[PDB]
Amino acid sequence: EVQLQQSGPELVKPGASVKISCKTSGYTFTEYTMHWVKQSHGKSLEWIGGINPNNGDNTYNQKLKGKATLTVHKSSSTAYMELRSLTSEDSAVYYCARDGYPYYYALDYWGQGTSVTVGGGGSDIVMTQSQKFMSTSVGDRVSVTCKASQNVGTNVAWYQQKPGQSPKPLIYSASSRYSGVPDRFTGSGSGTDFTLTISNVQSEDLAEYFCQQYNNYPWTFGGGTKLEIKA
Amino acid sequence: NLCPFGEVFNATRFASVYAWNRKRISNCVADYSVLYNSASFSTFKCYGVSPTKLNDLCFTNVYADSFVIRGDEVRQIAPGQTGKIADYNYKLPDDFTGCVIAWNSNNLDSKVGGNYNYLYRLFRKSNLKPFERDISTEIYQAGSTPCNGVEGFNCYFPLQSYGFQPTNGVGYQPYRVVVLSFELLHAPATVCGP
Ligand SMILES: *[C@@H]1O[C@H](CO)[C@@H](O)[C@H](O)[C@H]1NC(C)=O
């Protein structure tokens, strides 16, 4: 049983620094790469960077302008993220999450999140979810669209997020379901136009839905589409 | 007439393990006790066969595989072993029949601040089948993001260099290895010995 247990909330003021941890269990720590993702209140997901725990290799989103550093401690099976020179704009929930390659691609397990309170590169891929809010009725068939600004093949994942929870992985490789994901959820598309389809929508599908590409670094997410379900 | 083992054992250059060399040996006779009673073989291990009995046997074909690895890896050149060498570079089958011969080659295959001419494969999508050989150099994908042939984060050149220096531990010094394998098939047996 895989688990990513992150450390508790932090309150800081401008100029200081925070270090948060992500303790893993249920699997061999060194066999899977760990990623970090930021979510500003109400805002969308942003990829911070990744680290291969077996060799310490790491990479970062240039948007962060160098303020994050990732480390691991192989002994305690723990990953760390340190943020420096914190400002107003750094208040967000910070997630650790596991790249499930080569079995389930993209981010197949997520920590519970750590609250921290105090334009892009020209070749970055933009994922556009043009709908921010949809209302439908129970039983409807729902289509959530996501467009990529460059060809991303089928290297696209979809996640589901309910308030106060980490994102739940639904779809990877554009059309495959993660473990335990109901058949009502299907993904389609290739190249630049992707859709998540929910067949016979139920009350428990009330959530915000996010696409993401992992065809190139930095990994990028769509802005999210909230789905409201009425009787 | 006589099997050319000196051609194999006494070659000037040896293959890297990832590109291990095979010499087929047929239609000849040689004394194996010449080899077993030779000198400075630090490993001479046989499987399914005894060195002394090889003189009384005939095989359809005999292959001599040779390469260089690290001293502490010679133990992986054996049936049933795991590790970077057995998994990714040179794999014997579980029911191997043959002999494994190794000797320290430090002062032939090392250098001043390090010989970096011998390579081994550190990454591979799956384990080698027995007697499989992989000489490819495609970038190895360690995460979900494809590499497109570019080295980078989670995108690794799959071969690594041996750090062969005198003053290394002896476990880190180069050893030359020869693996003889014997196969008795339906066809006529042409490798026998006295
Ligand atoms: C390799 O050369 C040595 C002499 O340096 C010789 O004694 C040995 O028999 C040779 N190995 C053969 C012929 O297999």
CSV table of C-alpha atoms and ligand atoms in Angstrom, one decimal:
chain,number,residue,atom,x,y,z
A,1,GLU,CA,0.0,0.0,0.0
A,2,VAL,CA,1.8,3.1,-1.3
A,3,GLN,CA,1.6,6.2,0.9
A,4,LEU,CA,3.2,9.7,0.6
A,5,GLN,CA,3.0,11.4,3.9
A,6,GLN,CA,3.9,15.1,3.8
A,7,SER,CA,4.8,17.4,6.6
A,8,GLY,CA,2.4,19.9,8.2
A,9,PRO,CA,1.5,23.5,7.4
A,10,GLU,CA,3.9,26.4,7.6
A,11,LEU,CA,3.3,30.2,8.2
A,12,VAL,CA,6.3,32.4,7.3
A,13,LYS,CA,6.8,36.0,6.3
A,14,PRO,CA,8.7,37.4,3.3
A,15,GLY,CA,12.3,36.7,2.9
A,16,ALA,CA,12.5,33.5,4.9
A,17,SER,CA,12.7,29.9,3.8
A,18,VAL,CA,10.8,26.7,4.3
A,19,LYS,CA,11.7,23.0,4.0
A,20,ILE,CA,9.0,20.4,3.7
A,21,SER,CA,9.3,16.6,3.6
A,22,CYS,CA,7.5,13.7,1.9
A,23,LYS,CA,7.9,10.4,3.6
A,24,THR,CA,7.2,7.4,1.4
A,25,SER,CA,6.3,3.8,2.2
A,26,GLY,CA,4.7,0.8,0.5
A,27,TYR,CA,7.3,0.6,-2.3
A,28,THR,CA,11.0,0.7,-3.0
A,29,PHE,CA,11.8,4.4,-2.7
A,30,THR,CA,14.8,4.5,-5.2
A,31,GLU,CA,12.8,2.9,-8.0
A,32,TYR,CA,10.5,5.8,-8.8
A,33,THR,CA,11.1,9.4,-9.6
A,34,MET,CA,9.4,12.0,-7.3
A,35,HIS,CA,7.9,15.3,-8.6
A,36,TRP,CA,6.7,18.4,-6.8
A,37,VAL,CA,3.6,20.4,-7.8
A,38,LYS,CA,2.3,23.8,-6.5
A,39,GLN,CA,-1.3,24.9,-6.3
A,40,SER,CA,-2.2,28.4,-5.4
A,41,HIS,CA,-5.5,28.8,-3.6
A,42,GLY,CA,-8.3,28.5,-6.3
A,43,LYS,CA,-5.6,28.5,-9.0
A,44,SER,CA,-4.2,25.8,-11.2
A,45,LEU,CA,-1.4,23.2,-10.8
A,46,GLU,CA,2.2,24.2,-11.5
A,47,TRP,CA,5.1,21.7,-11.8
A,48,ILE,CA,8.1,22.6,-9.7
A,49,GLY,CA,10.6,19.9,-10.6
A,50,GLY,CA,11.6,16.3,-10.1
A,51,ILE,CA,14.3,14.2,-8.6
A,52,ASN,CA,15.4,10.6,-9.3
A,53,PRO,CA,16.1,9.3,-5.8
A,54,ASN,CA,18.4,6.5,-6.9
A,55,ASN,CA,21.0,8.9,-8.2
A,56,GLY,CA,20.0,12.3,-7.0
A,57,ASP,CA,19.5,13.7,-10.5
A,58,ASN,CA,17.1,16.7,-10.5
A,59,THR,CA,15.4,19.2,-12.7
A,60,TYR,CA,13.4,22.4,-12.1
A,61,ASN,CA,10.8,24.6,-13.8
A,62,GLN,CA,12.6,27.9,-14.7
A,63,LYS,CA,9.5,29.8,-13.6
A,64,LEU,CA,10.6,29.2,-10.0
A,65,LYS,CA,13.8,31.2,-10.9
A,66,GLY,CA,15.9,28.8,-8.8
A,67,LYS,CA,14.1,29.3,-5.4
A,68,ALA,CA,13.4,25.5,-5.0
A,69,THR,CA,15.9,22.8,-4.3
A,70,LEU,CA,15.0,19.1,-4.2
A,71,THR,CA,16.9,16.5,-2.2
A,72,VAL,CA,16.3,12.9,-1.0
A,73,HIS,CA,17.3,10.8,2.0
A,74,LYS,CA,17.5,7.2,0.8
A,75,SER,CA,17.7,5.8,4.3
A,76,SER,CA,14.5,7.3,5.6
A,77,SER,CA,12.8,7.0,2.1
A,78,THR,CA,12.1,10.7,2.3
A,79,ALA,CA,12.1,13.5,-0.2
A,80,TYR,CA,12.6,17.2,0.7
A,81,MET,CA,11.8,20.4,-1.0
A,82,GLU,CA,13.3,23.7,0.3
A,83,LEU,CA,11.9,27.0,-0.8
A,84,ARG,CA,14.0,30.2,-0.2
A,85,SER,CA,13.3,33.9,-0.3
A,86,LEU,CA,9.6,33.3,0.0
A,87,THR,CA,7.2,36.1,-1.1
A,88,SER,CA,3.4,36.7,-1.2
A,89,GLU,CA,3.2,34.8,-4.5
A,90,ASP,CA,4.6,31.6,-3.0
A,91,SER,CA,1.6,30.9,-0.7
A,92,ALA,CA,0.2,27.7,-2.1
A,93,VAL,CA,-0.5,24.1,-1.3
A,94,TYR,CA,2.6,22.0,-2.3
A,95,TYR,CA,2.4,18.4,-3.3
A,96,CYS,CA,4.9,15.6,-3.7
A,97,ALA,CA,3.9,13.0,-6.2
A,98,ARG,CA,5.4,9.8,-7.7
A,99,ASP,CA,6.1,9.2,-11.4
A,100,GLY,CA,4.7,5.7,-11.9
A,101,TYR,CA,6.8,5.0,-15.0
A,102,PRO,CA,7.1,2.3,-16.4
A,103,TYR,CA,3.8,0.9,-15.1
A,104,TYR,CA,1.3,3.8,-14.8
A,105,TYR,CA,2.7,6.9,-16.5
A,106,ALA,CA,2.6,10.4,-15.0
A,107,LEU,CA,1.7,11.0,-11.3
A,108,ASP,CA,0.1,7.8,-10.0
A,109,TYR,CA,0.4,8.6,-6.2
A,110,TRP,CA,0.2,11.9,-4.5
A,111,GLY,CA,0.9,13.2,-1.0
A,112,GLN,CA,-1.8,14.9,1.0
A,113,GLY,CA,-0.4,18.4,0.4
A,114,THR,CA,1.4,20.9,2.5
A,115,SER,CA,0.0,24.4,3.0
A,116,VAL,CA,2.6,27.1,3.0
A,117,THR,CA,1.4,30.6,3.8
A,118,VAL,CA,3.4,33.9,3.9
A,119,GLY,CA,4.3,34.3,-18.8
A,120,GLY,CA,6.4,31.3,-19.4
A,121,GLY,CA,9.3,30.1,-21.5
A,122,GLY,CA,8.7,30.5,-25.2
A,123,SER,CA,9.0,26.8,-25.9
A,124,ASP,CA,6.9,25.7,-22.9
A,125,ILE,CA,3.8,23.8,-23.8
A,126,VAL,CA,0.5,25.5,-22.8
A,127,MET,CA,-2.4,23.2,-22.0
A,128,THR,CA,-5.7,25.2,-22.4
A,129,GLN,CA,-8.9,24.1,-20.7
A,130,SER,CA,-11.2,26.8,-22.2
A,131,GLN,CA,-14.1,25.9,-19.8
A,132,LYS,CA,-13.7,26.8,-16.2
A,133,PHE,CA,-17.1,25.7,-15.0
A,134,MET,CA,-19.8,23.3,-16.4
A,135,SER,CA,-23.2,22.5,-14.9
A,136,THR,CA,-24.9,19.2,-15.9
A,137,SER,CA,-27.6,16.9,-14.5
A,138,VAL,CA,-27.1,13.5,-12.9
A,139,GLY,CA,-26.9,10.8,-15.6
A,140,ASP,CA,-25.6,13.2,-18.4
A,141,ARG,CA,-22.7,12.4,-20.6
A,142,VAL,CA,-20.0,15.1,-19.9
A,143,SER,CA,-17.1,16.1,-22.2
A,144,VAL,CA,-14.1,18.1,-20.7
A,145,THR,CA,-11.8,19.4,-23.4
A,146,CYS,CA,-8.1,20.2,-23.3
A,147,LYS,CA,-5.9,21.7,-26.1
A,148,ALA,CA,-2.1,21.6,-26.3
A,149,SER,CA,-0.2,24.4,-27.9
A,150,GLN,CA,2.2,22.0,-29.5
A,151,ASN,CA,1.9,18.3,-30.5
A,152,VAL,CA,2.2,16.2,-27.4
A,153,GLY,CA,1.4,12.8,-29.0
A,154,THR,CA,-0.6,10.8,-26.4
A,155,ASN,CA,1.5,11.8,-23.4
A,156,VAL,CA,-1.4,13.4,-21.6
A,157,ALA,CA,-2.8,12.6,-18.1
A,158,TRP,CA,-6.1,13.7,-16.5
A,159,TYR,CA,-6.7,14.2,-12.7
A,160,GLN,CA,-9.7,14.7,-10.5
A,161,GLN,CA,-9.7,17.0,-7.5
A,162,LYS,CA,-12.3,17.5,-4.8
A,163,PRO,CA,-11.9,20.4,-2.3
A,164,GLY,CA,-9.3,19.7,0.4
A,165,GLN,CA,-7.9,16.7,-1.4
A,166,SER,CA,-4.9,16.0,-3.6
A,167,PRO,CA,-5.6,15.3,-7.3
A,168,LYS,CA,-6.7,11.7,-8.0
A,169,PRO,CA,-5.2,10.2,-11.2
A,170,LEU,CA,-7.8,9.2,-13.7
A,171,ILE,CA,-6.2,8.8,-17.2
A,172,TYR,CA,-2.7,8.5,-18.6
A,173,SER,CA,-1.4,8.0,-22.1
A,174,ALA,CA,-4.4,10.0,-23.2
A,175,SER,CA,-6.8,7.0,-22.9
A,176,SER,CA,-5.7,4.5,-20.2
A,177,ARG,CA,-7.3,4.4,-16.8
A,178,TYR,CA,-5.3,4.2,-13.6
A,179,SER,CA,-5.9,1.4,-11.2
A,180,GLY,CA,-9.4,1.3,-9.7
A,181,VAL,CA,-10.8,4.0,-12.0
A,182,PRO,CA,-14.4,3.4,-13.1
A,183,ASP,CA,-15.3,2.6,-16.7
A,184,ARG,CA,-17.4,5.7,-16.9
A,185,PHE,CA,-14.2,7.7,-17.4
A,186,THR,CA,-12.6,7.7,-20.8
A,187,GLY,CA,-10.0,9.8,-22.5
A,188,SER,CA,-9.4,10.3,-26.1
A,189,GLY,CA,-7.3,12.4,-28.5
A,190,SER,CA,-3.8,12.6,-29.9
A,191,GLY,CA,-1.6,15.5,-31.1
A,192,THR,CA,-3.2,18.6,-29.6
A,193,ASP,CA,-6.9,18.0,-28.8
A,194,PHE,CA,-7.8,15.9,-25.8
A,195,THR,CA,-11.1,15.1,-24.1
A,196,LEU,CA,-12.1,13.4,-20.9
A,197,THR,CA,-15.6,11.9,-21.2
A,198,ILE,CA,-17.7,10.8,-18.2
A,199,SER,CA,-20.5,8.5,-19.3
A,200,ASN,CA,-23.2,8.5,-16.8
A,201,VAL,CA,-22.2,11.1,-14.4
A,202,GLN,CA,-22.9,10.6,-10.7
A,203,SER,CA,-22.9,12.8,-7.6
A,204,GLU,CA,-19.5,11.5,-6.6
A,205,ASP,CA,-18.1,13.0,-9.9
A,206,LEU,CA,-18.6,16.5,-8.5
A,207,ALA,CA,-15.0,17.8,-8.8
A,208,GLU,CA,-12.5,19.9,-10.8
A,209,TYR,CA,-10.8,18.2,-13.7
A,210,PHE,CA,-7.2,18.9,-14.9
A,211,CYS,CA,-5.3,17.7,-17.9
A,212,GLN,CA,-1.5,17.6,-18.0
A,213,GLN,CA,1.2,16.9,-20.6
A,214,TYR,CA,4.4,15.0,-19.9
A,215,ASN,CA,5.7,15.0,-23.4
A,216,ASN,CA,8.3,17.8,-22.6
A,217,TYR,CA,9.7,19.6,-19.6
A,218,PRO,CA,8.4,21.6,-17.9
A,219,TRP,CA,5.4,19.4,-17.3
A,220,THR,CA,2.3,21.7,-17.6
A,221,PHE,CA,-1.3,21.5,-16.5
A,222,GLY,CA,-4.5,22.9,-17.9
A,223,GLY,CA,-6.3,25.5,-15.8
A,224,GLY,CA,-9.0,23.1,-14.5
A,225,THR,CA,-12.7,22.6,-15.2
A,226,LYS,CA,-15.1,22.5,-12.3
A,227,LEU,CA,-18.1,20.2,-12.8
A,228,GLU,CA,-21.3,20.9,-10.9
A,229,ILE,CA,-23.9,18.0,-10.9
A,230,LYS,CA,-27.6,18.8,-10.4
A,231,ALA,CA,-30.5,16.4,-9.9
B,1,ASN,CA,44.0,-30.4,-35.8
B,2,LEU,CA,44.4,-28.3,-32.6
B,3,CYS,CA,41.9,-26.0,-31.0
B,4,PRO,CA,43.2,-22.3,-31.1
B,5,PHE,CA,42.8,-21.4,-27.4
B,6,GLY,CA,45.9,-19.2,-27.3
B,7,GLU,CA,44.1,-17.1,-30.0
B,8,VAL,CA,41.3,-16.5,-27.4
B,9,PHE,CA,43.2,-16.4,-24.0
B,10,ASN,CA,46.3,-14.6,-25.2
B,11,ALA,CA,44.6,-11.9,-27.4
B,12,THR,CA,46.1,-8.4,-27.0
B,13,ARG,CA,42.7,-6.5,-26.9
B,14,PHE,CA,39.7,-7.9,-25.1
B,15,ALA,CA,36.1,-6.8,-25.8
B,16,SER,CA,34.1,-4.7,-23.5
B,17,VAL,CA,31.5,-6.8,-21.6
B,18,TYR,CA,28.5,-5.1,-23.2
B,19,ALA,CA,30.0,-6.0,-26.6
B,20,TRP,CA,31.4,-9.4,-25.6
B,21,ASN,CA,33.2,-11.3,-28.2
B,22,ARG,CA,32.4,-14.9,-29.2
B,23,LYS,CA,34.9,-17.2,-31.0
B,24,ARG,CA,33.3,-20.4,-32.4
B,25,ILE,CA,35.5,-23.4,-32.0
B,26,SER,CA,35.0,-26.5,-34.1
B,27,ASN,CA,36.8,-29.4,-35.9
B,28,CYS,CA,39.7,-29.6,-33.6
B,29,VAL,CA,41.1,-31.2,-30.5
B,30,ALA,CA,42.7,-29.6,-27.5
B,31,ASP,CA,43.7,-30.7,-24.0
B,32,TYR,CA,41.7,-28.8,-21.4
B,33,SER,CA,44.0,-29.9,-18.6
B,34,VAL,CA,46.5,-27.6,-20.4
B,35,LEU,CA,44.2,-24.8,-19.3
B,36,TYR,CA,43.2,-26.1,-15.9
B,37,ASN,CA,46.8,-26.7,-15.0
B,38,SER,CA,47.8,-23.3,-16.4
B,39,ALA,CA,48.9,-20.5,-14.1
B,40,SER,CA,47.4,-17.4,-12.5
B,41,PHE,CA,43.7,-18.2,-13.2
B,42,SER,CA,42.1,-16.7,-10.2
B,43,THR,CA,38.7,-18.3,-11.1
B,44,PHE,CA,38.2,-21.6,-12.9
B,45,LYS,CA,34.7,-22.7,-12.2
B,46,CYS,CA,32.8,-25.3,-14.2
B,47,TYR,CA,29.1,-26.2,-14.4
B,48,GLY,CA,27.6,-29.5,-15.5
B,49,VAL,CA,31.2,-30.6,-16.4
B,50,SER,CA,34.5,-31.2,-14.7
B,51,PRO,CA,37.7,-29.8,-16.1
B,52,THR,CA,39.4,-33.2,-16.0
B,53,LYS,CA,36.5,-35.0,-17.8
B,54,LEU,CA,36.5,-32.5,-20.7
B,55,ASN,CA,39.3,-34.6,-22.2
B,56,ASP,CA,37.0,-37.7,-22.4
B,57,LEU,CA,34.1,-35.8,-24.1
B,58,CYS,CA,33.0,-34.6,-27.6
B,59,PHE,CA,30.8,-31.6,-28.3
B,60,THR,CA,29.0,-30.5,-31.4
B,61,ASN,CA,30.1,-26.9,-30.9
B,62,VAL,CA,32.2,-25.0,-28.4
B,63,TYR,CA,32.0,-21.2,-28.0
B,64,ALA,CA,34.6,-19.1,-26.3
B,65,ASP,CA,33.2,-15.8,-25.1
B,66,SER,CA,35.6,-13.1,-23.8
B,67,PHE,CA,35.4,-9.7,-22.2
B,68,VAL,CA,36.7,-7.6,-19.3
B,69,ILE,CA,34.8,-6.6,-16.1
B,70,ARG,CA,35.6,-5.5,-12.6
B,71,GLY,CA,37.0,-8.0,-10.0
B,72,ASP,CA,33.9,-7.9,-7.8
B,73,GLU,CA,31.7,-8.7,-10.7
B,74,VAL,CA,33.3,-12.0,-11.7
B,75,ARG,CA,30.9,-13.7,-9.4
B,76,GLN,CA,28.0,-12.5,-11.6
B,77,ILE,CA,29.4,-14.6,-14.5
B,78,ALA,CA,27.7,-17.7,-13.3
B,79,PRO,CA,24.3,-19.4,-13.7
B,80,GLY,CA,21.5,-17.9,-11.6
B,81,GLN,CA,23.3,-14.6,-10.7
B,82,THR,CA,21.8,-11.1,-10.7
B,83,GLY,CA,23.3,-7.6,-10.9
B,84,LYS,CA,24.3,-5.1,-13.5
B,85,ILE,CA,26.5,-7.4,-15.4
B,86,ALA,CA,24.3,-10.5,-15.4
B,87,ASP,CA,21.1,-8.5,-16.0
B,88,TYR,CA,22.3,-6.1,-18.7
B,89,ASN,CA,25.6,-7.2,-20.2
B,90,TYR,CA,26.4,-11.0,-20.3
B,91,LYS,CA,23.9,-13.6,-19.1
B,92,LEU,CA,24.5,-17.3,-18.6
B,93,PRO,CA,21.4,-19.6,-18.6
B,94,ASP,CA,20.3,-21.3,-15.3
B,95,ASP,CA,21.3,-24.7,-16.7
B,96,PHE,CA,24.7,-23.6,-18.1
B,97,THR,CA,27.1,-26.3,-19.1
B,98,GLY,CA,30.7,-25.0,-19.5
B,99,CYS,CA,33.5,-23.3,-17.6
B,100,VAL,CA,34.1,-19.7,-16.4
B,101,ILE,CA,37.8,-18.6,-16.4
B,102,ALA,CA,39.0,-15.3,-15.1
B,103,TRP,CA,42.3,-13.7,-14.2
B,104,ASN,CA,43.3,-10.3,-12.9
B,105,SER,CA,44.5,-8.1,-15.8
B,106,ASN,CA,45.3,-5.0,-13.8
B,107,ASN,CA,48.7,-4.2,-15.4
B,108,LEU,CA,47.4,-4.8,-18.9
B,109,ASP,CA,44.0,-3.0,-18.9
B,110,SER,CA,44.5,-0.1,-16.4
B,111,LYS,CA,46.2,3.3,-16.9
B,112,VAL,CA,47.9,6.2,-15.1
B,113,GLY,CA,44.9,8.2,-13.8
B,114,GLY,CA,42.4,5.6,-15.1
B,115,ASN,CA,41.7,3.5,-18.2
B,116,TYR,CA,38.3,4.5,-19.6
B,117,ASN,CA,38.3,2.2,-22.6
B,118,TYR,CA,36.2,-0.6,-21.2
B,119,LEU,CA,32.4,0.0,-20.8
B,120,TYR,CA,29.4,-1.7,-19.3
B,121,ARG,CA,25.7,-1.2,-19.7
B,122,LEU,CA,24.1,0.4,-16.6
B,123,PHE,CA,20.5,0.7,-17.9
B,124,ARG,CA,18.2,-1.5,-19.9
B,125,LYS,CA,14.4,-1.8,-20.3
B,126,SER,CA,14.5,-5.6,-19.6
B,127,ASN,CA,17.0,-8.2,-18.6
B,128,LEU,CA,19.1,-10.1,-21.2
B,129,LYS,CA,18.1,-13.5,-22.3
B,130,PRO,CA,21.0,-16.0,-21.9
B,131,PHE,CA,23.8,-15.4,-24.4
B,132,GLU,CA,22.0,-12.3,-25.7
B,133,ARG,CA,24.1,-9.3,-26.7
B,134,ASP,CA,23.1,-5.7,-26.8
B,135,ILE,CA,25.4,-3.2,-28.4
B,136,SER,CA,22.9,-0.3,-28.8
B,137,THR,CA,23.5,3.2,-27.4
B,138,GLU,CA,20.0,4.6,-27.3
B,139,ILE,CA,19.3,7.1,-24.6
B,140,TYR,CA,17.6,5.3,-21.7
B,141,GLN,CA,14.2,6.7,-20.5
B,142,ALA,CA,13.9,6.5,-16.7
B,143,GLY,CA,10.7,8.5,-16.3
B,144,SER,CA,7.4,9.2,-18.1
B,145,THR,CA,8.9,11.9,-20.4
B,146,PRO,CA,10.5,10.7,-23.7
B,147,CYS,CA,14.1,11.5,-24.4
B,148,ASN,CA,14.1,12.0,-28.1
B,149,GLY,CA,17.7,10.9,-28.2
B,150,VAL,CA,18.9,13.8,-25.9
B,151,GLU,CA,20.8,13.2,-22.6
B,152,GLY,CA,19.3,15.0,-19.7
B,153,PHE,CA,17.2,14.6,-16.6
B,154,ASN,CA,16.0,10.9,-16.5
B,155,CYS,CA,17.5,10.4,-20.0
B,156,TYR,CA,20.8,8.5,-19.6
B,157,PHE,CA,23.5,7.3,-22.0
B,158,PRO,CA,23.2,3.6,-21.2
B,159,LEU,CA,26.8,2.7,-21.0
B,160,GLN,CA,29.1,3.6,-18.1
B,161,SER,CA,32.9,3.7,-18.0
B,162,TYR,CA,35.1,1.5,-15.9
B,163,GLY,CA,37.4,3.4,-13.5
B,164,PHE,CA,40.4,1.0,-14.0
B,165,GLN,CA,43.4,2.4,-12.0
B,166,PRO,CA,46.3,0.8,-10.3
B,167,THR,CA,45.8,1.7,-6.6
B,168,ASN,CA,42.1,0.8,-6.9
B,169,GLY,CA,41.0,-1.9,-4.5
B,170,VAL,CA,41.6,-5.2,-6.2
B,171,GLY,CA,37.9,-5.7,-6.5
B,172,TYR,CA,37.9,-2.6,-8.8
B,173,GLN,CA,40.8,-3.8,-11.0
B,174,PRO,CA,40.1,-5.2,-14.4
B,175,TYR,CA,39.8,-9.0,-14.9
B,176,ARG,CA,39.8,-10.8,-18.2
B,177,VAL,CA,37.1,-13.5,-18.5
B,178,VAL,CA,36.7,-16.4,-20.9
B,179,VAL,CA,33.5,-18.5,-20.9
B,180,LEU,CA,33.6,-21.8,-22.6
B,181,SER,CA,30.2,-23.3,-23.4
B,182,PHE,CA,29.7,-26.9,-24.7
B,183,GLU,CA,26.7,-28.1,-26.7
B,184,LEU,CA,26.0,-31.7,-27.7
B,185,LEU,CA,23.5,-31.6,-30.5
B,186,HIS,CA,22.2,-34.2,-33.0
B,187,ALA,CA,24.9,-33.3,-35.6
B,188,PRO,CA,28.4,-34.8,-35.5
B,189,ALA,CA,30.6,-33.8,-32.6
B,190,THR,CA,33.9,-32.3,-33.8
B,191,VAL,CA,35.5,-30.8,-30.6
B,192,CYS,CA,36.9,-33.6,-28.5
B,193,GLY,CA,40.3,-33.5,-27.0
B,194,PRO,CA,42.9,-36.4,-26.5
C,1,LIG,C1,49.3,-18.1,-23.8
C,1,LIG,O1,50.8,-17.7,-23.8
C,1,LIG,C2,51.5,-18.4,-22.8
C,1,LIG,C3,52.9,-17.9,-22.9
C,1,LIG,O2,53.0,-16.5,-22.6
C,1,LIG,C4,51.4,-19.9,-22.9
C,1,LIG,O3,52.1,-20.5,-21.8
C,1,LIG,C5,50.0,-20.3,-22.9
C,1,LIG,O4,49.8,-21.7,-23.1
C,1,LIG,C6,49.2,-19.6,-24.0
C,1,LIG,N1,47.8,-20.0,-23.9
C,1,LIG,C7,47.3,-20.8,-24.8
C,1,LIG,C8,48.2,-21.4,-25.8
C,1,LIG,O5,46.1,-21.1,-24.8
